[PDB]
Amino acid sequence: TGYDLSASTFSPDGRVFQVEYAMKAVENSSTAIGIRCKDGVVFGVEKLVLSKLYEEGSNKRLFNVDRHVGMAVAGLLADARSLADIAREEASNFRSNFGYNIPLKHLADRVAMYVHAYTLYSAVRPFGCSFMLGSYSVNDGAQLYMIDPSGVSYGYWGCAIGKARQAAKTEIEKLQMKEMTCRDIVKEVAKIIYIVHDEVKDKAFELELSWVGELTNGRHEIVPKDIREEAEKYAKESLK
Amino acid sequence: GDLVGVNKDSYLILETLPTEYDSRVKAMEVDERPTEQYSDIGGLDKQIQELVEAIVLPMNHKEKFENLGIQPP
Amino acid sequence: GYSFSLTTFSPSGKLVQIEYALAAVAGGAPSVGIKAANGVVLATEKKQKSILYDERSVHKVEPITKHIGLVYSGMGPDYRVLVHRARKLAQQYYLVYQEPIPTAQLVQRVASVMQEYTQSGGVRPFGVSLLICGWNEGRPYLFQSDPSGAYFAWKATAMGKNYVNGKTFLEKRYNEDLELEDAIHTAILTLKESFEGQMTEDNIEVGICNEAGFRRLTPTEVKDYLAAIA
Amino acid sequence: SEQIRELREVIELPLTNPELFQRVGIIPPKGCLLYGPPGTGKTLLARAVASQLDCNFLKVVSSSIVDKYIGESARLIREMFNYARDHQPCIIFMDEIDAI
Amino acid sequence: SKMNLSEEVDLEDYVARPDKISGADINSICQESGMLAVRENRYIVLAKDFEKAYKTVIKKDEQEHEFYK
Amino acid sequence: SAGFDRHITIFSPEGRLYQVEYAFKAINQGGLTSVAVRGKDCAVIVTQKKVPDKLLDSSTVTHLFKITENIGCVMTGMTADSRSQVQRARYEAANWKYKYGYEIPVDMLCKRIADISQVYTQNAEMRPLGCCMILIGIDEEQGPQVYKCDPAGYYCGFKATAAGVKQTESTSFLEKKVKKKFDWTFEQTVETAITCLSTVLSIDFKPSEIEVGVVTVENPKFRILTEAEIDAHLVALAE
Amino acid sequence: MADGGSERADGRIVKMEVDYSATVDQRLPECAKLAKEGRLQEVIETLLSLEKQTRTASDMVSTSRILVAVVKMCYEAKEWDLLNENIMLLSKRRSQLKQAVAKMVQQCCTYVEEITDLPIKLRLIDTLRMVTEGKIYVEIERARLTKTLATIKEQNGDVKEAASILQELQVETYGSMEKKERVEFILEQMRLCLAVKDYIRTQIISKKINTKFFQEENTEKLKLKYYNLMIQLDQHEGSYLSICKHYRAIYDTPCIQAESEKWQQALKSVVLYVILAPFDNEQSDLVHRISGDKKLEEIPKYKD
Amino acid sequence: CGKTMLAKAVAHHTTAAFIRVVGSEFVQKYLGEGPRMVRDVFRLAKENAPAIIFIDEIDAIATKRFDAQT
Amino acid sequence: LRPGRLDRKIHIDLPNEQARLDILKIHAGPITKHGEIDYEAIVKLSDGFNGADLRNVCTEAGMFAIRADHDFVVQEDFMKAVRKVADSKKLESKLDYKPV
Numbered sequence A: 001t002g003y004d005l006s007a008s009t010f011s012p013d014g015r016v017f018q019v020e021y022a023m024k025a026v027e028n029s030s031t032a033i034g035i036r037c038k039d040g041v042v043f044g045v046e047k048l049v050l051s052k053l054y055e056e057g058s059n060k061r062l063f064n065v066d067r068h069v070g071m072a073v074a075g076l077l078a079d080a081r082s083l084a085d086i087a088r089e090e091a092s093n094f095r096s097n098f099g100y101n102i103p104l105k106h107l108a109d110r111v112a113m114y115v116h117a118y119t120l121y122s123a124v125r126p127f128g129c130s131f132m133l134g135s136y137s138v139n140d141g142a143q144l145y146m147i148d149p150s151g152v153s154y155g156y157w158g159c160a161i162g163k164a165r166q167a168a169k170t171e172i173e174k175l176q177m178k179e180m181t182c183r184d185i186v187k188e189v190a191k192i193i194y195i196v197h198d199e200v201k202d203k204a205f206e207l208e209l210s211w212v213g214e215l216t217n218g219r220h221e222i223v224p225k226d227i228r229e230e231a232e233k234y235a236k237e238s239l240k
Numbered sequence B: 001g002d003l004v005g006v007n008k009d010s011y012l013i014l015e016t017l018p019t020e021y022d023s024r025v026k027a028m029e030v031d032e033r034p035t036e037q038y039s040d041i042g043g044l045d046k047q048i049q050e051l052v053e054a055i056v057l058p059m060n061h062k063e064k065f066e067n068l069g070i071q072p073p
Numbered sequence C: 001g002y003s004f005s006l007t008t009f010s011p012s013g014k015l016v017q018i019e020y021a022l023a024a025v026a027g028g029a030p031s032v033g034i035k036a037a038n039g040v041v042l043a044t045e046k047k048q049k050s051i052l053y054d055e056r057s058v059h060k061v062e063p064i065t066k067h068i069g070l071v072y073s074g075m076g077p078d079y080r081v082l083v084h085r086a087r088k089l090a091q092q093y094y095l096v097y098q099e100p101i102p103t104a105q106l107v108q109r110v111a112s113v114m115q116e117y118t119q120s121g122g123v124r125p126f127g128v129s130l131l132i133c134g135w136n137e138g139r140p141y142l143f144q145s146d147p148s149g150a151y152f153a154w155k156a157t158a159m160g161k162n163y164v165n166g167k168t169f170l171e172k173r174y175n176e177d178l179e180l181e182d183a184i185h186t187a188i189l190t191l192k193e194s195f196e197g198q199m200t201e202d203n204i205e206v207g208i209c210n211e212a213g214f215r216r217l218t219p220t221e222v223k224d225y226l227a228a229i230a
Numbered sequence D: 001s002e003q004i005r006e007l008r009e010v011i012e013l014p015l016t017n018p019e020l021f022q023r024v025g026i027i028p029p030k031g032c033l034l035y036g037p038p039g040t041g042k043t044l045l046a047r048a049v050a051s052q053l054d055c056n057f058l059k060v061v062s063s064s065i066v067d068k069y070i071g072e073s074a075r076l077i078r079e080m081f082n083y084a085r086d087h088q089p090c091i092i093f094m095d096e097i098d099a100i
Numbered sequence E: 001s002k003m004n005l006s007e008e009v010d011l012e013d014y015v016a017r018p019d020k021i022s023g024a025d026i027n028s029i030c031q032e033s034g035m036l037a038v039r040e041n042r043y044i045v046l047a048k049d050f051e052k053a054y055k056t057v058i059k060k061d062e063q064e065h066e067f068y069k
Numbered sequence F: 001s002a003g004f005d006r007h008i009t010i011f012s013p014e015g016r017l018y019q020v021e022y023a024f025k026a027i028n029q030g031g032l033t034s035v036a037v038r039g040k041d042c043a044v045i046v047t048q049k050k051v052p053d054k055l056l057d058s059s060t061v062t063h064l065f066k067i068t069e070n071i072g073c074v075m076t077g078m079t080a081d082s083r084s085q086v087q088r089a090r091y092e093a094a095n096w097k098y099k100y101g102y103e104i105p106v107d108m109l110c111k112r113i114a115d116i117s118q119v120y121t122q123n124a125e126m127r128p129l130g131c132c133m134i135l136i137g138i139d140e141e142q143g144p145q146v147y148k149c150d151p152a153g154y155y156c157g158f159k160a161t162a163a164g165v166k167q168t169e170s171t172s173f174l175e176k177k178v179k180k181k182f183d184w185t186f187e188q189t190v191e192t193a194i195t196c197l198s199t200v201l202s203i204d205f206k207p208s209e210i211e212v213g214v215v216t217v218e219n220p221k222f223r224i225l226t227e228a229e230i231d232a233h234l235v236a237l238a239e
Numbered sequence G: 001m002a003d004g005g006s007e008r009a010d011g012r013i014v015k016m017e018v019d020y021s022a023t024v025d026q027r028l029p030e031c032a033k034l035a036k037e038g039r040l041q042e043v044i045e046t047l048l049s050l051e052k053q054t055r056t057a058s059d060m061v062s063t064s065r066i067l068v069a070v071v072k073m074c075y076e077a078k079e080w081d082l083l084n085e086n087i088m089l090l091s092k093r094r095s096q097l098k099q100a101v102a103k104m105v106q107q108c109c110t111y112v113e114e115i116t117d118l119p120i121k122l123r124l125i126d127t128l129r130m131v132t133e134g135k136i137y138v139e140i141e142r143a144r145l146t147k148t149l150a151t152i153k154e155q156n157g158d159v160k161e162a163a164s165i166l167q168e169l170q171v172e173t174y175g176s177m178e179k180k181e182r183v184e185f186i187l188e189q190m191r192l193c194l195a196v197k198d199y200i201r202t203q204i205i206s207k208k209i210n211t212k213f214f215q216e217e218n219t220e221k222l223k224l225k226y227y228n229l230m231i232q233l234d235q236h237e238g239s240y241l242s243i244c245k246h247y248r249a250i251y252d253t254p255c256i257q258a259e260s261e262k263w264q265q266a267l268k269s270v271v272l273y274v275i276l277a278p279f280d281n282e283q284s285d286l287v288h289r290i291s292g293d294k295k296l297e298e299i300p301k302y303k304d
Numbered sequence H: 001c002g003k004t005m006l007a008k009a010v011a012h013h014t015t016a017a018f019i020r021v022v023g024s025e026f027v028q029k030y031l032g033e034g035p036r037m038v039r040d041v042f043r044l045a046k047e048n049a050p051a052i053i054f055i056d057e058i059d060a061i062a063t064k065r066f067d068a069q070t
Numbered sequence I: 001l002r003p004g005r006l007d008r009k010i011h012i013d014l015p016n017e018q019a020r021l022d023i024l025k026i027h028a029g030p031i032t033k034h035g036e037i038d039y040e041a042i043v044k045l046s047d048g049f050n051g052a053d054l055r056n057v058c059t060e061a062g063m064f065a066i067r068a069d070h071d072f073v074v075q076e077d078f079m080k081a082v083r084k085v086a087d088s089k090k091l092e093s094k095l096d097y098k099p100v
């Protein structure tokens, strides 16, 4: 506190508050969760409609970095767009220098070191974003990663980013995710969103579900749950 | 602590005449009885409960704080 | 106080941050250096905080060329910078002139390096003073630089903590003509003035200059030298 | 349980046995520093020392003696000893040693 | 002198030591060894504690961060 | 008192500076402790892990980092500054092999690390990386070694090593430990490396809560112990 | 959960002689693996005390004979291994080993009149190894004291057993002094100190007694009869007035205990050497207190 | 190094009015009270016997060395 | 720090996770209930880390007993009490205090 202006200064007890201040700016964003089954990764983002003039698919938070890699950002949306273009550019140089797809364990290291560099100098500020990284391969399986604004990056089986970070992972861990298929996961992700405050004190929302795994043959794309609409049909039955 | 009546010169207690107050304390008792309701107040719903649980219930339920066996502040 | 910075003067006197940099020199480990008639003796103090620290890992007496050695009193992390600077600078003379650099020539140049960090305005000065020895052209030499950039030529001196007691010792002690073997005898006897309790073969670390080149002493001789020779 | 007793005989043995303080000879073992949280420790284990004799307690607010000129404060020292003279080892309980 | 030592343990082995001690800390040594025998229920100093009380108070160079020497 | 030089890296009156020595208490927010022990011809790293979540994985937690095939390390302090410190360590270990044609000594590497941490103190305008590094390695004609690098740019090699939160309690145990002249036959090393951390932290850990890196002069490759043989050394000390 | 280990222990107590007792130690590590589990409520302390009871009962049957070594080597087996067995970091110190050996020191109280002195002090020297660690905190804190007093009466006391008790005195004020039995233990060592002719140490450990008084109400023949050794302490140099103040203190109980020979010699012993104190105001009014007695004229030293 | 003990040793074997004053209770607030406490000592001293005024520490305020433009 | 002012010092620690249950059953004393309580099920779900504030946990469980007309205290009321009290502890700033 006064000793908290620059990002290159220490507190008298030994922490940087400019990193601490940017972490709870991610806290005010809506909840985006991630989960992986035994043969794929399923994303899911609670996204709220601003007033009414939103045109049903604008400014999405499910990006597409590589052929098999996408993001699940939450926080400052404009800061995540510039950070997503770094990961698009980083995966292109690995293709041009080595001739094959980027491993997700190596991709998250290159991004987190880039986020780390904005937490050291007084000229720039730390980012205000946190996001997810999911991929699938036949020689590596499915992985799911997690990057904070400080730059700590390691793997989970399931996660949540937003207001309800604790309130979502309470009921994620009561799932037998080690053996389910990622078609049964999709109907289970939608009830985790709709339990915790979809439109209670808010106005409206719309669910987005991204999708990667064995059924897509390594491709990353949005779900065909505009087809048959089964996520909302199965989750709205959990009213009682 | 008694408001006894004492002779001037002899300084000897003569009468008792207790419990006498001035007009300033008598003016402090409210005879207005204002008309404010809780519907007029908005945005303080946590503090509304924490007041009624603290003061109003010891005013009403003297024995509910007895059979449970705690002390209201 | 005006000070806070290095690129401006005080209204009355001199640069204050360079004076504060000299305070870190006085709070360092003690050291001593004596110029005898046939050589120069360097000796310093080196105690570990625990019994766990390997004493034969990091050295204090550090050779620059085959006839030039160097000690310090300040902060060891800043010491390793200008040592590596003085190594590469000493080779640049030898590539041009094909001749080992005289001891009065490094101190022209090493002090100009410590000069440059006293400039503007976001860098800090060093917190290290030095003692530089060597036997060039018969006569031996013993100099001393500072973080301000000046230099000297000593007969005998002592830096570090309690230097005023070692100075009044050496003022009462140092004569003009002794050999190198008598010089080490009064160089440990001035280290015993301000040292701590035990003084073993690993608490001190001593290097010398002959005319046969620079050499630092192994603890086999230093145990046998401190064995009952006062 | 470790601190009920570590504080006990470091107070008990000097007050019960002043004769060993002439078998070698030194008078002041003058007490421990109880530091940590507020918790319940400052007020409750002071009553754990009250288990044998003890009693005294009184109170030290650490504020009425801290007046600036200490010519009054030295009298405010001995003002509290007007009851501590009335007994055997009186046990001056002292709260908020360091608190202003 | 005003302390019942009563041993054959010679104190001048601590006179001849270096690590120069301030005069207040000499008073701390003899009082600490008084504690370091009575607390162990001894009616006399046996002066095997006197080594430990000497090594206790002499350790004041606390951290210094192993930095700037 | 100071007050004075407590924002940026300049001198104090008499005589120190505070921003570097605030990084020394920047390790302690990790809430962790690491122990390195060199007794004889082998070398042992031991460090606990702390997994606070069931959704959190197990493989992506380990602080044991393989620098080269014969040099391993462990990292304390805060997490994000630790990994960028390792990236410089992996990088300059390969430049030695390219420029000079042979394997880098473990002694030479801490010089190259602490000099990079030196410039950030001398020249300003970069935060000086509040993490600590401990190295082990095998040297020809020198035996095994244990080194420690500091955020100030200090380094010193020494036999028994603690870091993290509990240096002053673990090193106090190891001074009394390494004073007797007992030999260290590769299980005398490990059992003391366990029981020092086991009593200072007061955990006496369950088998799945730690890591143990090792190197030995019979197989100089850096080696992370299997969870099964961690249990074998744990049932060895408690017979 | 652990009732299977109990019915297997029902098998092994029948098969102590039908099967050999090493097989009881071969069924034992399965019950150790049950103790290795010890999770929350299933196979934890209360049922763990049952296998600890039955393994000691099998240790009773196996080493009731002069083949004693099995009960001892099973103890340094399990009591070094319990750090790996039940819970790491100082497991409970709560009913996992305590009453299993508190039964055994009760058995050492039984066998000391039967077994000879050699294998019982081999039994004691192997139980002192873990009693120095824990298990004598409280209930029962005198698991050490009922057997270290037995070590005194092995050779019936000497210089060494006085040193053996003075080194272990305050460890049960380090557990919790017992209004009565702790006072009864902390008195007993100084008559051993008088056997080693120690007097300055004797009065230091005697000054701990003075605050625990008025328990002679429930004490018939022990409280004010140990103080007949406290006058032996002040028998030494000259303190004649103080031990006549002492005789008036022990004057009361043989008037409660209405005797006419033990109480009469209390009148005899007090009237002899109030005289032998040097003259003072304290002697001058004490004789003015003790004269005028209704009981003093039973003796012709009323004339004296 | 045994400084205050020497002042206490004089107070025994003298026949004076020993006055010891810490050099810290007059560097306080309330502008003007500081210099009057110096007067309160000496008016109490010079009214009395041959006396000793022992100021304990002036490693506090004892040095001008600049004109204070503050 | 000389012998005679703070002759020996001692630090008090805030958590034990088992001296919770000691202090809990003290404060789960004179409060009417059934004996229905799994007291360890309180402790494992409790994260208070302060002995004076676990006193506040048993106070608010009686407030949940005032709620829904419980003359006894059900085991749910303590689990209700931890979610109210320990969440209120988390929402306060100025968390730097250390005795020297």
Ligand SMILES: [Mg+2]
Pocket (backbone or CB within 6 Å): H003, H004, H005
């Ligand atoms: Mg003084």
